[PDB]
Structure formats: C-alpha cells, structure tokens
Design a protein around this nucleic acid. Structure first.
Ligand SMILES: O=c1cc(NCC2CN(C[C@@H]3Cc4ccnc(Cl)c4C3)C2)c2cc(F)ccc2o1
Ligand SMILES: [Cl-]
Ligand SMILES: [Mn+2]
Ligand SMILES: [Mn+2]
Ligand SMILES: [Mn+2]
Lengths: 671, 670
DNA sequence: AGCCGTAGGGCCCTACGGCT
DNA sequence: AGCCGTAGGGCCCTACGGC
C-alpha cells in the first residue's frame, strides 16, 4: 500500500497520490525515496459530497489517506501533525484522471480545508500521450514530474471560500439539474485557483462522458465503444461467412487500435451486442456462453468467439465509399469512423441506455418493419405528424416480447421524447390437475432479471406479504423457452394473485423513456420525429456522397481507359517510344506529349503488363468503357434530381425491410 | 454455488462438476433444470493425497461437494444420505481438465470411495476442439454431452483396491520418483476402470507439461510460451526499429494464434523476458512499469507496451530461410515454429527455470562472450574436455551480479548437470563518521526479492535474533542502483554482524543447478558440454538449411531473369507473339514453344510491365542476373565443403559475440 | 433499494519440484 | 516453510442519473 519515504521531517517530505498500483510501481521506481512518499489509490474515489459519513469513514481509500496524512479531519484537524508539507495529486493525464482529481479535491476541501489554505496541496503535471503512469518509464516520470529541479507543480490556492462551497456543491452535489445547467452553459464542442480547477477539470470530464462515451449518435445509434468494436470487426474482415474469432484478440486489437480503455468495457459491450435478450437486432454473432437472462455473466473473453451479424453489414455498408468522414484515433496512428453509414435506423431499432453526467438517456427498441415504413412515410411528407407515424410505428418492440399496457405513455414519449411505459409479463392461468391451477409466465419485461424476479417472489411468499402461493418454479429450458410456474392454493382466485404480483414484483415493470442522443455532436432530447428526420437526412448525405464518390471513381477509370485505348491503337510506337527512353520520367514525358496523355494515363500504360496485349482486351476495354459511360449518365442523373436521389434511398431501404424486417413481438393491449 | 435441480429424488438426480462459472453458464443453459444439478468448481483442486487433514477439511471447494453430496465423508460417510445417484465429472476437454479429473477421483476414492463402489461416479465426455465448456453453445453441450439419449457417459468402476491404492499413491503421492519412473516407463512421444483412467488421464497431463510447457528446448532455450510470444512479435514485425505495441493486443494476438492459455501466463512470461534483473539478455523491450526487484508486479497489460530486443533478432534471424521445421498450431488455422534458429546459445545465456511433473529444471544464466568462446573452442575439438571448456566458461553470470563462492559446485553442475552454488551479496563495510560504520550492500543474489530480504532483516532485529544494528535503509535509486545500508552500533564488529547476516538471510543463497532440457523432444539432464553440442548441432543444421534454401530461390530467380533477358533480346518477336494470341493461355503456350521457355518464364514475361522496357530497367534486369550468378557460386562452395560451412558458423557466431558480448557481472571468488 | 452500462482501479486460491 | 514460473479457475470498490 503506502510507500513512505525515509525522512520523518514533515516540512521536507512529500506524498504523491496515484490512481493505483500500476501507476505506483513507476512512481516508486522513479522517486527520490528520501523525501517522496506514494499512496496508490483504487480508481474512482468516493464522492464525499454525495455520500453520508458512516459510508465515508468506512471507505478504505479514504481511511488510507487520513491515516497517511496523520492530521485527523474536520474539527480534529491538526495541521501541526502533518507528516508532509506537499501532498501531490498525480492522477493519469486523461479525463478520468481529471475526474479523480475533482474527487480528491472535494475530499480535501470538505475534510481538510486548512491543508489547502496552508498551500500544502499540489497537483503534479505529468505529460499526455500515456494511458496511465504505468506506461511511462521510471526515468521519464521523475524528470518530467518529480524532479524538483524541473517539475512544475501547481500549488492549490484558495481565494474565495464562498465561491468554492457553491462550486463543490454544484459540481459534486446531489442535485443533477444544476450540474446539467453548468454544463449546458459551459459546454463548447505555478499556482492554481481551486475554483477554476474544479470547474475546468470537471467540465472536461462531463463533456467527454457526454459526447464520447455514454450517449449514442442519433445517426447510427452507436456509442464509440460499439462503433469501434464493429469497425474493428469490419477492418479485420470478420464477417458472417467467415469463421468465428477469439474475443481476446478482438478486445486487445480494438483496445490497441481504437478504444484505449479497460478490457471489461470493451469485452462487455461486445457481449451485449450478441445477446438476443438485449438487442432487438443483434449486431454481434456469438460462439459460446454469452450470459443469460438470469444475470449470468458471459464466459471470460478467453473462452468466447464472435463475428458480425448479417444485419451489421448494413451498418457498415458503403463505408469505404466516402459516405462518412473519417477521423484519427486517440494516438493519431489510425483512422476511425466518426459515424457509420447505418443503412438502417439503428438508434431506434435497438434502442439505447446510458448514464452520463448531468443527464441520462433511455431509448427503447422498436420493430424494424414499422420504423422503415415510418421512415418511408416521412420520406413522402416532411410535415407528417406524430400520430400519423404511430400508424406505422405502433410502439416499442422488446426483444423479450411480453406485453404493453395502453398507448398513453407511448404517445407522450413519441411527442416529447419522455414518457412512461408499463411492461407486463405474459402470464396465463391454467389448470394443473386435481382441481388446482397455476400461473404460467412465458415472457418477462425487458431488462428484467428472471432469477432476481423469482427471488423477490419467493421473498414475498416467505414474508407472507402475499397470500395463496404454494410452489414456485422456473422450468425455463432451451426446449421450452421461458417457463415460470407459480402454483396457487386450491380454491384461491388465481387472478387476484396475479394482479398482486404485477404490483408487487418486476412481473410488471415500467420503461422510462428519455430519448437523449447526440445531435450535431450535442446532447439533445428528441421526440420520435426528429429522431427519424435525422436518420433520414443521414441516409441522404450517405447515398449522395456515395454517388458523388462512385462518380469521381468512374471518371478516373474512363480517363485511364481513354489512355489505354490510345496505347493499344499505337502500341508499336508505344513500345519503341518506351524502349528508347532511359528513365520512366523520360518515357512519361514523351508519352504525354506525343499522344496527348495525362500522367495517370501515362502511368497506367507504363504499369501495363505485356499480358494486356492479348488480342481481345481492346474490346474488353472497349466493352468496359462503354458501360462506364452508361453508368456515369446514370449517376449524373441521380445527383441532378434530388427526388431521384430520394427514391433510391426509398428503394434501398425497402430492400432492407424485405430482407430483415420481422413480426412484432410485444403485444400492445389497450389499457 | 450449486445450481440444484428442482426435483429432490436422488434416484434420478445427477450433479455435473465443471471447472468454473464460465463452463457452468453453458451447462446451465443446456441442461435439464428438473434433474441435473450443477456445481462449478474453481480450477485445479486440492491434491488430497498431498494435503493435511485440517487443511483439507477447510478447503472451500471440498466443503461444497460434501455439502452438495449431503453424505459426509470417511467414517461418517452415509451413502444413504446421497442427494444424487450420478456424480458426473465434466471437466474441460484439455490436459488440465484431465488433471482435474485425477484430482477429483483422488478425493472421491480417499473419502467417498463408496460412491465409486456404488457406481455413482460418472465421467462426461465433452467433445474436443473447444477451449472449455464456455466456448460451446448450450445446445451443442446438451446434445453431445448432457442429453441422456445421445451422451456417452462412462461409469467409474473400481476393480482391484490394492491396485487402485498403489496407483493413487504412486500418481498423487508426494514421492516424486515413483511418478517419474512411471512416466519414463510409460512415456509415449461404456465403463472405465478407475486405475486405467487415472493412469491414462494423469500420464496425458504429465506428458503435455513435460514436452509442451515447463521445460525449455536445448536448441533455443525457449519454452513454448516464450517461443510463441517472440515468434508472434516477429510475425507482427514488432521489431526494435518499429515502435512499441500495447501488451494487451500482443497477448490477445498470441493467445488467439498460438497460445491457448490464460493471459496471465502469457503476459507474465512476456514481462519476465523484459526484466533486466530476470533475463541475462532480455528478449523483450518493454515500455513502462514492468515490475521491480521488490516483487512489485508489472503494470496491467492495458498500460504497457513491448517489442523485440535487438538480440531477439538473432534468435529469430533467418527463420524464413527454411531453417527450422514449422508445425500446425492447436487448431490448424496457423503454423508455428518448432524451434527458433537461435543464432546464439539462448539456453545457457538466459538459463531456464521450470517446475514440471516428476521433474524440474534450473539452468543458470551465463556470459555470452564466454558461451560463444566455448562453442568456438568446441567447434575445433569435438573431444574437448569439460575442464577445457571452463577455460571459456568460468561459471554462471547472473544479471544481478553478486558473488559466487568457490567452483566445486559449478564444476559439479557442469559435469553432471547438477550441483549447488553458493551466491552472496556484494557487501562492504565503511565508516559513516564519529568512529561508526555501516554495511553497504550494492548487489544481491539472483532471484532474491529485495524488499522481503530487508523485511527479513528487520524481523531478526525486532525478534532480537541478531544484535548490533542501529538502522537499516534502502537508499536505492536509479542514479545509485542498488544500495542497502545497515548501520552498525559503534564499537560492534561489523564483520561479525555481516557474518550472522549471511547465515540468517538471503544475503547468501544457493542456486540448485538442475540442468534438464528437451533433447530430441525428450527431457534430459545434460552436462554443460552436451548443452553446447546440441546447440552447435542446431546451428549447423540451421545454416546448412538457410544455404540450401538460399540456393533454390536464387536458381528460381535466375531462371526467371534468363527469361526476361531473352524477352529483352527479342522484344519485337515477343510483342508479335502476344499481340497475335487471342488469350493469355494461347500466348503462354506460344512463348514456351517459340522460345523454349518454361511455363514460369513464360508467365514472368506476360506479367512484365511495359515500364520494364526502359533502358534502366533492362540494366537492372541484367545487373541482378550477374550478381545472382556469383552469389550462386558462393553458396555452392559452402555446400561443397563442410569445413567451409563450419567456418561460416564460426564467423557468424563471432560476429554475434562482437556485437553483443559484454563484461562479466558475477564475481567468482575462490 | 439498487439496478441499468461504460468507465477508473485492483488480488486470491489450486498443482507441480526442489531447494532453503 | 514457502519460494521459484507456467498453468486451471474467479470478483470487488468507485462515479454517473433516473426511477
Ligand atoms: O486490458 C486488457 C486486459 C486484459 N486482461 C485480462 C483480464 C483481466 N483479468 C480479470 C480480473 C483481473 C483482476 C484483478 C483483481 N482481482 C480480480 Cl478477481 C481480477 C480478475 C482477466 C486483456 C486480456 C486479453 F486477452 C487481451 C487484452 C486484454 O487487455
Ligand atoms: Cl512487378
Ligand atoms: Mn487511470
Ligand atoms: Mn411490478
Ligand atoms: Mn478449463
């Protein structure tokens, strides 16, 4: 744990706080052991502005610091008892390191304010480009960050205690809405004042969580971790027709290439995209144990294999035709997509769920046939209304099936982006023999843990909080599908029992809609229409850019083809012209001038292999050339009449609906 | 946590024992929840043959089977209290599953012997091709293994209790040697009798660990994990000139392609190869917290990055030149090297350390100049004596420097493969002012944890087990290197204190030399000479094959160039021939016919780009031909004569020693 | 309540041989 | 005794918002 220095003269000593043991090892290896101590922490640290005291005092990482500092806390804070006069925060140089810093200041500020007032609290400034202090060699760390001769600490200054109380309460407090407002007002897409630092550090954290972690893009419906996963699967060509591949490779690969975060965030995001109880349309095809509806985790990543689903191909379809803008990855050594072509409205179809900072999102999945007809109808009428859409899109369609009670929250969510929706299991009452009945549950509400739900029921019977239940079993199986059996006592009204379980168990459960997604890179709450409007315009830009791309590429080809026909019509002079040229450059120049060729045409000829002279290519080329001219007119046509552009989108979407659309699962009963 | 079945009638109740919760998931998803209970365990389970009773009674996974079985054990075993009539062992279908099988039986036999007597014990037979049962889809597991209508269970049958007795004790007992005899005796390079299965399961496990895990190869000194790692580094071109790559993806890559084992075994083996205090010549070049001599682990693999060292390039040099035999990986989707060319004696240079089954290895690191001078001397005197070799190779050379006391143990290790080697820290006594002194240690023995040792010293001071010390400081730094200061009480005899310290602490330690390596695929205790003979033999083959390889490719290419030269000699004919051929196939036949070309020459011409017709290109074509002709002769000379070939290896080894040889670090004192 | 899902962070048991 | 290194297997805390 704590790696203390040897000098017991506090005023000369210093303790450094690092995010964990990985960072601690480099920090132990580079320090001057005489005067520098190290306490590795354990990641995110309790937000003592939110927690109550008993929990605070029983928190190990806190206790370690109090112990380590020796000054006591609060009323008993005794600054003279300090064992170091420099406490240095040295978190990783990332937003998460910045968050932790805010977490640490909050504590010092809430429980050790004089420590700040005496200027005992400093902030190391380690350099960027490292995932964590564990990535630095021990000599670079000491020099950049720990050598007093050159390190650049920032002593924490406390200017206006009134301004600081509000900051910690605003930034780190129970009340989300002031958090959210501070972000909205400040989001923009030697010594240090503790107010600016908290504001500046925490805003970078929040913003990063919002636009690059927890919320999905309206266009493709994806978060970066999923976008990176499927992209990585794409880039490695791991498609449905190819065999499965090991999850660990994938994770390490994506982690090295696109997603610089722990394997668990990567592995578990990939796991969910494969669970058919999680994804209305699974994007990942899984080989092996990928968890269960009882809350069983997936097998460890070394055991499992995965690959793209077929529908995933439509997300990536046309990605290499300049339909979307690529960007550089975290270290610059790679390009990654900012968004996928998403040839189907993935956001609504699979829905979404995220806890951000200052906000959350909660978007239910939907039936794909309805959505496309939804997008189809919108394609034909920009002023279409919400209720006219719910003729196509009757509502959410959970991968778990089950039932929905009434259309009242559906409509409010679609009109406002927020609304509440009751999900009911599918339960029938049936006879079990000898004058007794049983309740049989074959479908459960979305995101509900079956075992947990069974547990609670057992809990009520045992607690006599519910009367009339005799036995309780889970007969679920592969051969059966879900089958949960509740045996009722003879001559009891099974229906009153059922109505109790809905009220008293997750047997009935509510989905709270909170459709926030990223719109032009900014979080926005959207109603159903804006969600569809955005996907549509996305599809418009996609098909357009793709058409503009196929067109550049065809004109290039013909120009090369024009050049090659010439070469063929004068090959003997071509050859000798070449034979008598010392350098390519000489030849390049000579070809251009004699035959009015461009460089490409001229290059393409030089690269032409002898085998291309066979007697028949000249028409093969001629043949190819002519179709090319028909293709170009065809393309030029689409880019010159937006209505033509639109109908093609309709066609390709229609094509999608026929292939992948399916029946509704969730029954919507009028409440 | 047992997943019990809803029913409660032992007559029809089966409990499936599986390695863990990953395996337990698929099993639960495909089983019949009505009648099949599942108890996931936690990997290698306690060897009850080697454990102490109280310790056994307090083992968690043991207690769980009992509690689950509900029949007690040993004396108070009450078969009537059985809660299942089938205890089905469903370990993964790997050698480690087989080991775990042997460990379960051992417990059943020794403590629940009636179960077997009653025939209640069964062995599921999951199909091969899977890593564990978590890689299976539930339906596949149910159909092939759990469905009573298609499965092929084996019921366990005791047949001779004296035989079983002797066997269990032989296999699982703490007597290593009877286990070793059994292997060497039986090494090969429905129902089921319990003796047959144990014998067969255990032997299968031991074989695998002997030949494919724990022992290095005499030729390259590598264990399979190291080899596959370095090889993997090579295939991905993670070379010293290129930049570091994240450990995590290397691990994932090595694991997927070559090493189907836990990332911990992969990462830590990689880490060891990069620690300058573990490897005498680090094979890996690592970036970040790769641990310390204090037993600090490395940083997690999401944090670190790695690449080959330069010297690793010499382990891998010319692997493409058909120098070693490739093999199929574990699933036939890849090829991997059987050994590396090892253009330097890696076995002795970095030594090896490995607990196997029935045996272990402990080879110490050595100085490379010496090693290579050893080989060089050997190469001129097949009959050189071990003493003559020690004139090159004075003894091990630990990465940690330090002292070795005497040479009789060395001399014993090198002549027998075995011998004991007393190591000591480098400690001096110096004054600190005021007539006082201190003991300053600047080097510690090999593989000694430094912090532990200091903590050990502080205990004896506390426990008063030693007297005369007033302070004890680890003043180590990157600028200092190692420096541990023991402050001595004024007028004490600091030498006397130093002497007690050596007796009571790892300040002195011994290295037990146990030089066992894989020779022709089999484990062997070798002497130093043997080790070098095989190395040199390895180098001989490697360079011969490279040369034979280099010769075929040159000949191929010269052949091709001969065809381009002809095409150049008659380009106009060439053009006509092609221009009046309707297809490439027609053209190709015409070129062969018209120019007496082989098919391959004919294609090279067809593929020739127009740009090859310019004056510079044709020169390049002619020039490369002329060089090839000379290179070809050079090669043939070497195959014409063994001394020439033999002289080359010396040259290349000498080359290597000049590039990488360094000074001795460990001092051999008399 | 505590859970939902992307995030920060980390340690334990077992087998096996041989040396102290 | 318990350490040396390749191996089987697995789990906890924290932040974040909404209900
Ligand atoms: O970044 C990573 C991390 C990987 N890590 C292996 C997993 C981390 N290990 C699980 C926990 C660790 C730990 C600590 C303390 N206590 C407990 Cl219980 C545990 C269990 C296995 C990884 C593996 C790959 F194949 C490829 C890329 C990888 O990239
Ligand atoms: Cl070419
Ligand atoms: Mn970090
Ligand atoms: Mn309910
Ligand atoms: Mn296993």
């Amino acid at each position: 744990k704590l790696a203390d220095c040897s000098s017991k003269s506090p005023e000369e000593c210093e303790i450094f706080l690092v995010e964990g043991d990985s960072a601690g090892g480099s920090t132990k290896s580079g320090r001057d052991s005489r005067t520098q101590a190290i306490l590795p922490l354990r990641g995110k640290i309790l937000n003592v502005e939110k927690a109550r005291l008993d929990r605070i005092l029983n928190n190990n990482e806190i206790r370690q610091m109090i112990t380590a500092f020796g000054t006591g806390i609060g009323g008993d804070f005794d600054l003279a008892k300090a064992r170091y006069h420099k406490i240095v925060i040295m978190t990783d140089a990332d937003v998460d390191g910045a968050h932790i810093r805010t977490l640490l200041l909050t504590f010092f500020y809430r429980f050790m304010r004089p420590l700040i007032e005496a200027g005992y609290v400093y902030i190391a400034q380690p350099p960027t480009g490292y995932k964590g202090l564990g990535e630095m060699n021990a000599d670079q760390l000491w020099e950049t960050t720990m050598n007093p001769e050159h390190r650049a600490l920032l002593q924490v200054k406390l200017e206006d205690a009134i301004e600081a109380d509000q900051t910690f309460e605003m930034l780190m407090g129970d009340v989300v809405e002031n958090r959210r407002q501070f972000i909205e007002d400040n989001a923009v897409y030697n010594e240090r004042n503790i107010t600016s630092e908290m504001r500046e550090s925490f805003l970078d954290y929040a913003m990063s969580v919002i636009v690059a972690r927890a919320l999905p893009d309206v266009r493709d419906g994806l978060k970066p971790v999923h976008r990176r996963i499927l992209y990585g699967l794409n880039e490695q060509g791991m498609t449905p027709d190819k065999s499965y591949k090991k999850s660990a490779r994938i994770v390490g690969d994506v982690m090295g290439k696109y997603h610089p975060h722990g394997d668990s965030s990567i592995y578990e995001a990939m796991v969910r995209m494969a669970q058919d109880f999680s994804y209305r349309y699974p994007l990942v095809d899984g080989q092996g144990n990928f968890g269960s509806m009882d809350g069983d985790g997936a097998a460890a990543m070394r055991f499992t294999e995965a690959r793209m689903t077929k529908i995933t191909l439509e997300l990536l379809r046309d990605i290499n035709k300049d339909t979307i803008d690529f960007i550089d990855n975290y270290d610059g050594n790679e390009r990654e997509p900012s968004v996928l072509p998403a040839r189907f409205p993935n956001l609504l179809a699979n829905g979404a769920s995220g806890i951000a900072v200052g906000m959350a999102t909660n978007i239910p999945p939907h039936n794909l046939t309805e959505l496309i007809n939804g997008v189809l109808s919108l394609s034909k009428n920009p002023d279409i209304s919400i209720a006219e859409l719910m003729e196509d899109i009757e509502g959410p369609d959970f991968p778990t099936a089950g039932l929905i009670l009434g259309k009242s929250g559906i409509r409010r969510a679609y009109e406002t982006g927020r609304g509440s929706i009751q999900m009911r299991s599918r339960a029938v009452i049936e006879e079990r023999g000898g004058g007794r009945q049983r309740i049989v549950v074959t479908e459960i509400p979305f995101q509900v843990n079956k075992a947990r739900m069974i547990e609670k029921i057992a809990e009520l019977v045992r607690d006599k909080k519910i009367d009339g239940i005799t036995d309780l079993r889970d007969e679920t199986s592969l051969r059966t599908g879900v089958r949960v059996v509740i045996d009722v006592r003879k001559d009891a009204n099974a229906s009153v029992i059922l109505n109790n379980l809905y009220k008293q168990t997750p047997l009935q459960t509510s989905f709270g809609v909170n459709m926030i997604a990223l719109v032009n890179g900014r979080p926005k709450l959207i109603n159903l229409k804006e969600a569809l409007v955005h996907y549509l315009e996305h599809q418009k830009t996609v098909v357009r850019r793709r058409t503009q791309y196929n067109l550049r590429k065809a004109k290039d080809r013909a120009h090369i083809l024009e050049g090659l026909r010439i070469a063929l019509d004068h090959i003997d002079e071509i050859i000798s012209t070449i034979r008598e040229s010392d350098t390519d450059k000489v030849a390049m120049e000579s070809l251009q001038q004699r035959f009015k060729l461009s460089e490409k045409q001229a290059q393409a000829i030089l690269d032409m292999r002898l085998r291309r002279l066979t007697g028949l290519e000249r028409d093969k080329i001629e043949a190819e050339y002519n179709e090319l001219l028909n293709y170009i007119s065809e393309l030029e046509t689409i880019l010159a009449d937006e209505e033509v552009l639109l109908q093609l989108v309709r066609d390709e979407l229609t094509e999608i609906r026929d292939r992948f659309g399916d029946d509704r699962r969730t029954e919507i009963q009028l409440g």
